[PDB]
């Protein structure tokens, strides 16, 4: 090969950027204006598409006083309640009449064909020594999900043990972007646990694929907005194993969790509580083995220039603990075993977001933070990567 | 679309790295014992293949005492003769006999098939206000090859009005890479003369492709060494023009030279003086209109970590002047009109480096800076885009 | 096997050109693994990152068994490498009448810690307290002015001594018995301690006791040409200006390091605090380290803190806990004959 | 005369071709110190071409 390098943030303008202002000439053309008193007959948001087209909704109003509408469950008192909703997340919740007739927007934005949504204000913001991490940092005779990896200037975390879906089908690992790709060197070379300029270590492989930004009309599948410059940011890189490296010293087992299932696939047409409100787990080499729960999928954030940004998955830890720290970026997020079933992957951690983000409560407890993540499964057909689970699958395609 | 960084330069490593034992020991290796009295017969004549696959043979002996070796002419007394040779760039010549037995290397290195090489010692050392440049940086009513471009961070120069060879066949302009792309985040929308955060300007379009590193197996077509991590520095970015912008105010004419013909290609198998010693010209936004001569081709240097880097073309200015300044990266290099024939392009200026070893001499004159640059033909072969020169072909 | 000072020390100086390039610095006191130390002697190797041996190159791997002159063998293993609101802070830096074995010594810009009581053998056994070789010897002053809690320029000033004895470079062979390093140039890290009481300063208050342990035995002469129980794996205390009353344990010995250039200097007896707590902190490089009272017998201070090592590095023992700090030290049996001294443990014969 | 004499440190030219009177009547060359040999090594090399 050589190199390559196609499309930065910049391509896909007129023709389509007006095929988006066509389907959206009706976030109000189908209904009966504000009829307070009951529950817009029609029905109610019973999905996350059903409720994706409703913050997608009256978006001028919502996007007027806000910082990032999302889409979870009516949160109330302090614990997810079970009624779909539109978290007009804010800077700091407040009182009623002390408001300039406009600052606690209305809890009844409506929809396309009688679909009324629900609003409830929250407020937002922007090494753990043990022996389950002292092994992953290159002190155990088997590598796999969670192991330390570094190339020349960055430190990351070994993700899943992957294999391609095409002509060659090499076997490597799905790490993230900031630990993989740069260009001052003609090639990128990872090393475990350290490169030869930082300490000991052995050769791992080279980067051969990457992606950093995807437009939403192909990622999510729906327009999901009114500003047509939407970029659903994702992160992944296949890294084929070297020809000299011993394959026998690879374990396809998450040390700390157990045995993985296959894949959890998020399709936005299903009961809403099927993914939101479910316990999750994660093993990475900056926290050990932590646990959390899904809070609200499909966060939106549009910055000053007007660039759309959807960040898929929001997770907040359990029992007031942090889900991850800086350095855990790249570790798989695993759906907690559902009473006898094997645990399943739902996403790679896009980043621990150091202190970038804080889903706060008006209850008597401090600012517990959150974390992010990508939809692993729509990142598996954008890099043609696959999830390998059984340890007899490692020596089954390489063989 | 999206984003997507590929990079399989990795296409080497084991299956093809033993496939490079045809350099030594195998086939093109120990061939027919040499001889003294019978000077190598003569070594035929005309070739880059004729004299690269001799320099490729003894790369270790050369590299033992060098600063990089290219293929040019046997420079004697300062001028350019017709005897093919290789210039081994060095720190300093020094006397003939106060050497340890080898610092002035033997000039009789041989190759595969009884062809003897030839060596040299050169010594290597690791605006322009007028009205041809103020008509490029904003004060004009037409855009084209030579005009200034800036995206949101840096500044560049329009290369040439180009169109894609496949798909929808979009029409834009081929600049170099960091007028656009760079690192940590891409470079997406290019303005002329400036983006709206620096002054006035208009939208042109957006980058859509690009390249940056190639392997010395597919670019030149021959191994050209023994180091299996040899790389070609290439620089390009196709930029389809925007829909709102009027295309009726675009001129595919280089103001200052005239009108170019079609691309000239180097085939590495021809009389060697057909490209070396030829007068070349250019048009830039920071120098204006300068002329020069091609001194040597196929530069080669491997750095400390041990990866070779071929930098194609070496161009030095005429009458002791400099070809360019640090404003000209992206400008086309055009062969000077050969007595009535229309000029033809040979490469985009990779950048006025001229600091990784100046072409020095022992004549009574200071160092003269040179230029680098891709050999166009195989850069408009990778991104699959041609060059529009006729003012009526642009309309169609 | 190995049971003697030289049994390790001369193996060290022979394999030294075969030792110490895989990693910087190695200590030879005992084999430690599985969390604790066993009775197996060794040449334990400090490493930056403890990589499992499968991720190692054969040349730079661990040679488990080494052998040299005579017919004595040994073993090799791996180690890693890189306030107090109590009574004693107030009553050794101020509010106490007298100075006992660990009163804070206040330099112009630094502060150290009282050690033990000097004497001499030749000429005039002049009496003055002794402390380390960075508090007093500055990079700008050949001599410096020492005095109880704080100096005159930052507090109420009433002073104690001025340096004439300032030994810096101790030679190697007269000090560690035999050749220790195959590298030609290695003098010693030789922070010494002798310094007057300043002639007329009151002597009726100067008491001979450590405030928190009591009566201490004498100077001990180090001898590991006896069984390993003499110096390795022992229990030691800690009394200091900044740290308190902690109890440490002796792990290492003559360990030499390579800081930036590769300066390999003799970092004498190393101790680590118990219960995974810091042994000492900054400004405490004058505190004595006694062997614990062995069944009634009055304890003996072998060690002196050589410097503030809280910011130097830590050795991790991988026992589900973070890296724990280590402290340097200098043998008192060596300094005692370096500078003509005599340690006094009792009070009746201070002026005799 | 005129030719450089440079060994490490920095570089300098050659003073002259000279003869000593006292010692044993030999031949040498003269040097100007600061460009070389001042105090670091009064007994180090002096090289022509380059060291």
Tell me the C-alpha distance between A292 and A280, whole Å: 5
- Whether residues A7 and B11 touch (CB distance < 8 A) is answered with no
Alpha-carbon distance values, B241 to B70, B207, B248, B396, C199 (Å): 39, 9, 12, 14, 92
Task: Kindly state the helix (H) or strand (E) to which residue B309 belongs, with its residue range.
Answer: strand B308-310
Determine, for residues A2 and B13 on separate chains, whether the beta-carbon distance falls below 8 Å.
Answer: no
Pairing of strands A308-310, A230-236: parallel
What is the residue-wise DSSP string for D16-36? -EEE-SSSS--EEE---GGGS
Q: What is the DSSP letter of A339?
A: T
Interface size between B and D, measured as CB pairs under 8 A: 6
User: What is the dihedral angle through the alpha carbons of A319, A323, A325, A326, rounded to the nearest 10 degrees?
Assistant: -160
For residues B346 and B264, is the Cβ–Cβ distance under 8 A? yes
3-class DSSP assignment, residue C176: helix
User: Using CA atoms, how far apart are residues B384 and C39, in angstroms rounded to an integer?
Assistant: 73
For chain B, positions 58-77, list CB contacts with chain D under 8 A: none
Work out the minimum CA distance from A95 to partner chain B, whole angstroms: 40
> What separation in angstroms does the CA of A274 have from each of A117, A119, B228, B311?
19, 21, 53, 58
How far apart CA A56 and CA A30 sit, in angstroms, is: 15
Phi, psi of B94 (to 5 degrees): 70, 165
- Spell A84-120 as b/e; 16+ CB within 10 A means b: bbbbbbbeeeeeeeeeeeeebbeeebbbbeebbbbbb
> Are B94 and D48 in contact (CB < 8 Å)?
no
Structure tokens at A171: 């076997």
For residue B257, give the nearest of B145, B129, B161, B366 by alpha carbon.
Answer: B145
Euclidean distance between CA atoms B14 and C62, whole angstroms: 30
Q: Is B146 exposed, middle or buried (0-12, 13-18, 19+ CB in 10 A)?
A: buried
CA distance B94 to chain D (A): 7
Nearest to C328 by CA among C350, C352, C312, C351: C312
CA dihedral for B217, B218, B220, B222, sign (positive or negative) = positive
In contact, B351 and B329? CB cutoff 8 Å: yes
Taking the alpha carbons of C107, C113, C114, C115 in that order, is the dihedral positive or negative?
negative
> Backbone breaks in chain A (C–N > 2.5 Å) follow which residues?
126
Q: Is the peptide bond before A96 cis (omega within 30 degrees of 0)?
A: no
C-alpha span between B134 and B137 (Å, rounded): 5
Query: How far is residue B360's CA from residue B89's CA, in Å, rounded to a whole number?
Result: 9
b/e for A291-300, b at 16 or more Cβ within 10 A?
Answer: bbbbbbbbbb
Across the interface, whether the CB atoms of B307 and A186 are under 8 A apart is answered yes
B294 touches B350 (CB < 8 A): no
Task: Determine whether C316 is exposed, middle or buried from the number of CB atoms within 10 Å of its CB (0-12, 13-18, 19+).
Answer: middle
Resolution (A): 3.0
Judged by CB atoms closer than 8 Å, whether chains meet at A131 and C318 is answered as yes
Residue B163's Cβ-count burial label (10 Å; 0-12, 13-18, 19+) is middle
Find tokens 């420079």 and name the residue.
B75
String of DSSP letters for B183-196: SSS-----EEE--T
Q: How far is the C-alpha of A6 from the C-alpha of A19, rounded, in Å?
A: 25
Which of B7, B14, B185 has its CB closest to that of A243?
B14
**Structure token pair of residue C160:** 């104690």
User: How far is residue A397's CA from residue C174's CA, in Å, rounded to a whole number?
Assistant: 66
What is the spatial distance between Cα B209 and Cα A5, in angstroms, rounded to a whole number? 7
Residue A178: Cβ-neighbour burial (10 angstroms; 0-12, 13-18, 19+): middle
Q: Pick from C100, C125, C127, C126: which is nearest to C115 by CA?
A: C100
Give CA–CA dist B165/B169, Å, rounded. Answer: 6
End-to-end CA distance of chain D: 19
Find the angle CA(B374)-CA(B378)-CA(B380) to the nearest 5 degrees: 95
A&C contacts, CB < 8 Å: 41
Q: How far apart are CA B192 and CA B204, in angstroms?
A: 7
B119-121 and B79-88 beta bridge pairing = parallel
Q: Residue B152 corresponds to which tokens in the numbers above?
A: 């949101």
CA distance C315 to C326: 7
Asked if B6 lies within 8 A of A10 by C-beta distance, the reply is no
User: How far does CA C2 lie from the centroid of its chain?
Assistant: 24
Closest CA relative to residue B301, chosen from B289, B292, B314 = B314
Q: Which residue has the tokens 């009449």?
A: A97
Show Cβ contacts of residue B94 under 8 Å, excluding neighbours closer than 6 positions. Answer: B103, B104, D49, D50
Cα C128 from Cα C162, distance rounded (Å)? 10
CB contact under 8 A, B7 and A11: no
Strand ranges, E, within A26-175? 43-44, 115-116, 161-164, 171-173
Between CA A249 and CA A252 the distance in angstroms is 10
Element (H, E) at A391: helix A391-397
Number of CB pairs, chain A paired with chain B, less than 8 A apart:
137
Chains A and D physically touch (3 or more Cβ atom pairs below 8 Å): no
C-beta of residue B394 within 8 angstroms of C-beta of residue B250: yes
Residue A203 distance to chain C (closest CA, Å): 10
**Most B CBs within 10 Å: which of D3, D49, D51, as the mutation test of the B interface?**
D49
Rounded alpha-carbon distances, angstroms, from residue C291 to B49, C101, C273: 80, 15, 13
Closest residue in C to A193 (Cα) is C51
Neighbours of A288 (CB within 10 A): 20
Tokens of D21: 């009177």
Report how far residue C291's alpha carbon sits from residue C298's, in angstroms, rounded to the nearest whole number. Answer: 9
Q: How far apart are CA B388 and CA B172, in angstroms?
A: 10
CA dist C114 and C284 (Å) reads 9
Residue burial C173-183, b: 16+ Cβ < 10 Å; e: rest: eebbeeebbee
First-residue to last-residue Cα distance in chain C: 48
Provide the total of helices (H) and of strands (E) in chain D, helices listed first. 0, 4
Q: Do B7 and A212 touch (CB under 8 A)?
A: no
Q: How many residues does the structure list for chain B?
A: 396
Length of chain A: 399
Spatial neighbors of A239 by CB under 8 A, at least 6 apart, are A172, A173, A175, A180, A190, A204, A205, A206, A207, A208
Candidates C95, C105, C80; CA nearest to C326 is: C80
B79 Cβ neighbours under 8 A, 6+ residues apart:
none
For residues C149 and C112, the answer to whether their CB atoms sit within 8 Å is: no
* Rounded CA separation B192/B172 (Å): 13
Query: Residues with Cβ < 8 Å from B7, sequence gap 6 or more?
Result: A1, A3, A4, A5, A181, A187, A188, A207, A208, A209, A210
- How far apart CA A1 and CA A177 sit, in angstroms, is 21
Contact yes or no, A with C (3+ CB pairs under 8 Å): yes
**First vs last C-alpha separation in chain B:** 27
* Chain C CB within 8 Å of residue A247 CB: no
B376 Cβ contact list (under 8 Å, min separation 6): B263, B264, B265, B345, B346, B347, B348
Cα A239 to Cα A161: distance, rounded to the nearest angstrom: 10
Q: d(Cα C27, Cα C272) in Å, to the nearest integer?
A: 14
**Cβ B13–A206 below 8 Å, yes or no?**
yes
The verdict on a CB contact (< 8 Å) between B208 and A244 is no
Nearest C-alpha neighbor of C341 from the set C211, C223, C219, C162: C219
- CA dist B154 and B237 (Å) reads 15
Q: Return the H-helix or E-strand segment holding C89.
A: helix C87-90
CA–CA separation, B298 and B373 (whole Å): 10
SS3 call for C175: helix
Encode burial over B230-252: b for 16+ CB neighbours within 10 A, e otherwise: bbbbbbbbbbbbbeeeeeeebbb
**Chain D residues within 8 A of B94 when measuring between CB atoms:** 49-50
Structure-block tokens of residue C285: 């490089």
* Residue C321 near chain A (CB below 8 Å): yes
Beta bridge partners of residue C161, listed in sequence order: C146
Burial class (CB in 10 A: 0-12, 13-18, 19+), B98: exposed
Tell me which residue has tokens 């920071």: B286
Task: List helix spans (H) across chain B.
Answer: 59-64
Which among C233, C244, C217 is positioned nearest to C301, based on CA atoms? C217
Give the distance, in angstroms, between the CA of residue B42 and the centroid of all CA atoms in the same chain.
30
Residue B365 Ramachandran class (φ > 0 left, ψ -120 to 50 alpha, else beta): beta
Contact A142, A192 (CB under 8 A): no
Interface of B with A in 202-231 (CB under 8 A): 206-215, 218, 229, 231
Tell how strand B231-236 and strand B211-215 pair up.
antiparallel
Distance CA B124, CA B90 (A): 5
Cα–Cα nearest to C306, from C333, C342, C268: C268
């Amino acid at each position: 090969s050589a190199a390559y390098f196609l499309w930065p943030t910049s391509n896909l303008q007129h023709c389509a950027a007006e095929g988006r202002a066509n389907y959206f000439g009706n976030l109000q053309k189908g209904l009966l204006p504000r009829h307070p008193g009951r529950l817009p007959k029609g029905q109610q948001a019973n999905s996350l598409l059903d409720l994706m087209t409703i913050r997608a909704f009256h978006s001028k109003i919502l996007r007027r006083f806000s910082l990032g509408t999302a889409v979870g469950f009516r949160i109330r008192k302090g614990d997810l309640t079970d009624i779909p909703a539109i978290l007009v997340f804010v800077a700091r919740k407040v009182h009623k009449k002390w408001l300039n007739p406009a600052q606690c927007l209305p809890a009844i934005l409506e929809g396309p064909g009688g679909v009324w949504c629900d609003v409830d204000v929250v407020e937002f913001s922007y090494q753990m020594f043990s022996e389950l991490v002292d092994k992953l940092c290159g002190s155990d005779e088997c590598i796999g999900s969670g192991s330390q990896v570094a190339s020349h200037e960055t430190f990351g975390t070994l993700g899943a043990i992957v294999k391609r879906r095409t002509g060659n089908k090499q076997v490597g690992f799905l790490t993230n972007h900031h630990v993989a790709v740069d260009l001052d060197y003609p090639n990128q070379k990872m090393f475990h646990p350290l490169p030869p300029n930082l300490g000991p270590g052995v050769y791992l492989g080279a980067v051969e694929r990457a992606t950093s930004f995807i437009t939403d009309d192909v990622w999510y599948g729906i327009y999901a907005g009114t500003n047509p410059e939407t970029f659903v940011r994702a992160d992944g890189a296949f890294i084929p194993f070297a020809d000299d490296f011993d394959i026998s010293t690879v374990t396809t087992v998450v040390r700390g969790v157990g045995d993985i299932g296959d894949v959890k696939v998020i399709d936005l047409q299903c009961p809403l509580n099927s993914l939101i409100g479910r316990q999750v787990c994660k093993v990475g080499r900056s926290s050990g083995h932590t646990t959390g729960t899904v809070m609200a999928y499909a966060l939106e954030y549009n910055d000053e220039k007007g660039i759309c940004f959807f960040t898929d998955i929001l997770v907040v830890g359990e029992n007031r603990q942090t889900f991850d720290l800086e350095g855990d970026s790249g570790s798989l997020i695993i759906l907690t075993s559902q009473d006898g079933e094997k645990p399943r992957p739902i996403g790679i951690i896009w980043g621990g977001t150091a202190n970038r983000g804080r889903l706060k409560l008006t209850s008597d407890h401090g600012p517990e933070n959150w974390t992010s993540g990508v939809d692993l499964g729509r990142l598996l057909d954008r890099l043609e990567l696959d999830i390998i689970i059984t340890n007899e699958s490692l020596q089954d395609a390489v063989q």
